UniProtKB/Swiss-Prot annotation, chains A, C, D:
Annotation: DNA-binding region: 61-80
One GO BP annotation of this record: mismatch repair
Implicated disorder: Ataxia-telangiectasia-like disorder 2: A neurodegenerative disorder due to defects in DNA excision repair. ATLD2 is characterized by developmental delay, ataxia, sensorineural hearing loss, short stature, cutaneous and ocular telangiectasia, and photosensitivity.
Cross-link Glycyl lysine isopeptide (Lys-Gly) (interchain with G-Cter in ubiquitin): where in chain: 164
Region (Interaction with NUDT15): 7-100
Protein name (database record): Proliferating cell nuclear antigen
Location of the protein in the cell: Nucleus
Annotated consequence of substituting residue 250 to A: Complete loss of interaction with UHRF2
Lineage of the species this protein comes from: Eukaryota, Metazoa, Chordata, Craniata, Vertebrata
Alphabetical list of NCBIfam families matching this protein: pcna
InterPro entries: DNA_clamp_sf, Pr_cel_nuc_antig, Pr_cel_nuc_antig_C, Pr_cel_nuc_antig_CS, Pr_cel_nuc_antig_N
Listed result of changing residue 211 to F: Alters chromatin-associated PCNA stability and its function in DNA replication and repair
Main location: nucleus
Gene Ontology molecular-function annotations: chromatin binding; damaged DNA binding; dinucleotide insertion or deletion binding; DNA polymerase binding; DNA polymerase processivity factor activity; enzyme binding; histone acetyltransferase binding; identical protein binding
Curated annotation (Swiss-Prot), chain B:
Gene: FAN1
Disease: Interstitial nephritis, karyomegalic: A rare kidney disease characterized by chronic tubulointerstitial nephritis associated with massively enlarged tubular epithelial cell nuclei. The clinical picture is associated with recurrent upper respiratory tract infections in addition to chronic kidney disease beginning in the third decade of life.
Subcellular location per the Swiss-Prot or TrEMBL entry: Nucleus
Subunit structure: Interacts with FANCD2 (when monoubiquitinated). Interacts with FANCI, MLH1, MLH3 and PMS2.
Name of this protein: Fanconi-associated nuclease 1
Length: 261, 184, 261, 261
């Protein structure tokens, strides 16, 4: 019997927004140690992984490992009906095709219950090759969302050059070309201001901005994003959901001959 | 139409009285034409009309011809069994199904994908989709399974539904027949 | 000639938006008692009644009774140009051909005048019956509006159930089923943040959600909304217009089709 | 070479926004006196003049007078990327066709660099005759900005009828007529609330509104419009750009004989 009591419903509310437009259907892999989501987009180019642990859950009970196929758009519709302060009581019955969402009003006057139907998708056990990253970047989430939104107008591709003096974002289009670069923060102790860059070898790659805009819809989840990248490896964007888990994205670099042909 | 029924069969039964016509047609064509007479009298119309029409994978939901029946589906089953009306069946051809799909439907399919400029002119989205065929490097992120095109045709057939088409063999042989009849 | 001076122009403003999307034409029967409006809706389903007591107005005078056929959409457009804190001075002469609006400013530095064209309409009066109701609920206006929009994503039929400890808002759509219950609390000193139900006999009805969404448009009028229903009796939704008057909203329940058979 | 350093980057953003919907391409005439622009509108109805004196810029230098044809639409999109407090650093070199805009964050942590592609436009200069006007009115920008928007819902023709004690922005339409009459104010401590009017002759005119709505998009630049007209002379709307320059707007009055047909 699956029964989870989550105090901060906004945390679950935010997650669905990040997945609502990028993925429509996915398998909700659940274990006795926490939740685990992992799927691919329709265009089959990006990988999303969610590592929600069990410690953050106020009440966790997973008698057996389950996997439920749930319409992400359908979940978002139901989730948006719960306030940003309620107590989620997601609770699932063994092979019943019924996800009993229960919204607990902190005012303790309103009782809200919903049930949604479960689809039957198929699992593909996506292998995730652990592999180190030459260039490591952490910098506050808003500016990254700012930068990736600004360069959308000028172009469609971005050249990220992990320079030791500062990461520089460049795009080229028929409106012109523009480069944006930052400087490593030295004295500001605020964790929401550091632009620290870890350097192992210089790297330059290319990515489609239509997906970078999709990724950053999860800015309210955390203040700092972590970018790790190296030669011929997919881009990884990392968010830290407080202390209950992390939300990492995977973006394969645009092949260097795609623009040639 | 009575004229469609009246003429075609008359054309055949006057081209019948010419020993040269059988001298220029093999036994297989003769057997097909015998099957064609063998077809039900009310089943003549569906092959009579669509033959005198555009050759394309087109859905039955668009068809409105009712002078035979509103639910003449079993007649189409008979035609498919005999081997005139190829149903959905072997539909794995990306270009054909994309032509089959409708423009708003194409826009919707673009929305559930992550193409560039998912709002343009009909054929432009089609070759934009065919551009996605240049692939088999990213679908190999995990398992190889290169059927990206299989995914697109699956979702399009779900979007489109049923459709049929005429086999080239019959079309060709009766085109030969009526052109010999015309001789112009 | 008819002259009315209203200090609170926002009150008259808030009235229009609620009525603008539901009713096109109305007859404003004007008497020494005050302002009255009764108008059967466009789709010939719901009924709207409005009353404004003359005593609440700062200045009021009407020698002989009058009812004007006035376009709701057009006259609503004009008031959008008036500030929320103006002092409206609705005025219309005995020779009923045009309507004068005398929008003012708090600083008495800018005055705005507008002229409205009247229309001749057939005054079809309907005699509503005055009777008691089985289950009556007073509960915060904002919460009711939130409930209506939330269940609107599930189905098109909310099932009302006056119960022991509150109401049993129940949505039943193809995507799922949604049950929401509010616990009856009365110990709260703030009458605005309280729900009180008076029970006489249990009765269960159903109404379409499409009208309920429109019915909520008068939300800013007041913080509390009163609901009364009974067996085979149209639903009653009333908004208390400060100390000015009140607005009642009528909707007959659907006839439960023999879907069980 | 040409180098300009403006600390108040908001000025350029607001200026660029104002001319977006009225002018597609313009030729920027620059001299040692400062930046000047004169480009008659796309619709071939209104004339726009804009001037920037040199001393207003924190750092200005220009060896030879130049004239660049800039796609006005593209400039704003690039400008939209700049923040509200950056130090714009407009710079062009020799006889190139590339505008080098530079945005600098106040904290010196984020350096934004963009480049344009100039285009060749014919230099069409139109004479500006200087003469005296009949009514000159200095009135707060927000009040007028409200006025033009308000009268749009009625019709498409204002009738300004300057008099000895105020203004009478009347209008009319199929819905009716609206006569807004502001009252002259003189005893106000602040200059952002005075509507001082100087008149020599009475004047009654008529103008097209859809331009006027475009015409007030420069509202955030100032809070004091210096609108002025004379007999058979195009309307003059001027905003004082802090201590930077002036942005004057010209519109010829409409002919009454066209309204007869």
């Amino acid at each position: 019997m699956f029964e989870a009591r989550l105090v901060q419903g906004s945390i679950l509310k935010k997650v669905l927004e990040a997945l609502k437009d990028l993925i429509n259907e996915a398998c909700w892999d659940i274990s006795s140690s926490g939740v685990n989501l992992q799927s691919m987009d329709s265009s089959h180019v990006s990988l999303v992984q969610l590592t929600l642990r069990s410690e953050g859950f106020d009440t966790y009970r997973c008698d057996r490992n389950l996997a439920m196929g749930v319409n992400l758009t359908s979940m978002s519709k139901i989730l948006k009906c719960a306030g940003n302060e309620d107590i989620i009581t997601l609770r699932a019955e063994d092979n019943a095709d019924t996800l009993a969402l229960v919204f607990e009003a902190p005012n303790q006057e309103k009782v809200s219950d919903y049930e949604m139907k479960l689809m039957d998708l198929d699992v593909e056990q996506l292998g995730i090759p652990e592999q180190e990253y030459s260039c490591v970047v952490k910098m506050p989430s808003g500016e990254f969302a700012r930068i990736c939104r600004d360069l959308s107008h000028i172009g469609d591709a971005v050249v990220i050059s992990c320079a030791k003096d500062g990461v520089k974002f460049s795009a080229s289009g028929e409106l012109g070309n523009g480069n944006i670069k930052l400087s490593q923060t030295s004295n500001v102790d605020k964790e929401e201001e550091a632009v620290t860059i870890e350097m192992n070898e210089p790297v330059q790659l290319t990515f489609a901005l239509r997906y970078l805009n999709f990724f950053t819809k999860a800015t309210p989840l955390s203040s700092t994003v972590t970018l790790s990248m190296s030669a011929d490896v997919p881009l990884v964007v990392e968010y830290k959901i407080a202390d209950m888990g992390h939300l990492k994205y995977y973006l394969a670099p645009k092949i260097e001959d795609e623009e040639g042909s | 139409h009575p004229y469609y029924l009246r003429s075609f069969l008359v054309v055949l039964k006057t081209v019948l009285e010419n020993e040269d016509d059988m001298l220029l047609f093999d036994e297989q064509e003769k057997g097909i034409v015998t099957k064609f007479y063998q077809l039900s009298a009310t089943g003549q119309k569906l092959y009579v009309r669509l033959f005198q029409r555009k050759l394309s994978w087109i859905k039955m939901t668009k068809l409105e011809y009712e002078e035979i029946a509103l639910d003449l589906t079993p007649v189409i089953e008979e035609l498919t069994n005999a081997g005139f009306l190829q149903t959905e069946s072997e539909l794995q051809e990306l270009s054909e199904v994309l032509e089959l799909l409708s423009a708003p439907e194409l826009k919707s399919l673009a929305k559930t994908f992550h193409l560039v400029n998912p709002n343009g002119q009909k054929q432009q989205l089609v070759d934009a989709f065919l551009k996605l065929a240049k692939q088999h490097s990213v679908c190999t992120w995990g398992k190889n399974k290169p059927g990206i095109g299989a995914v697109i045709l699956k979702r399009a057939k779900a979007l489109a539904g049923q459709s049929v088409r005429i086999c080239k063999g019959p079309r060709a042989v009766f085109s030969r027949i009526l052109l010999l009849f015309s001789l112009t």
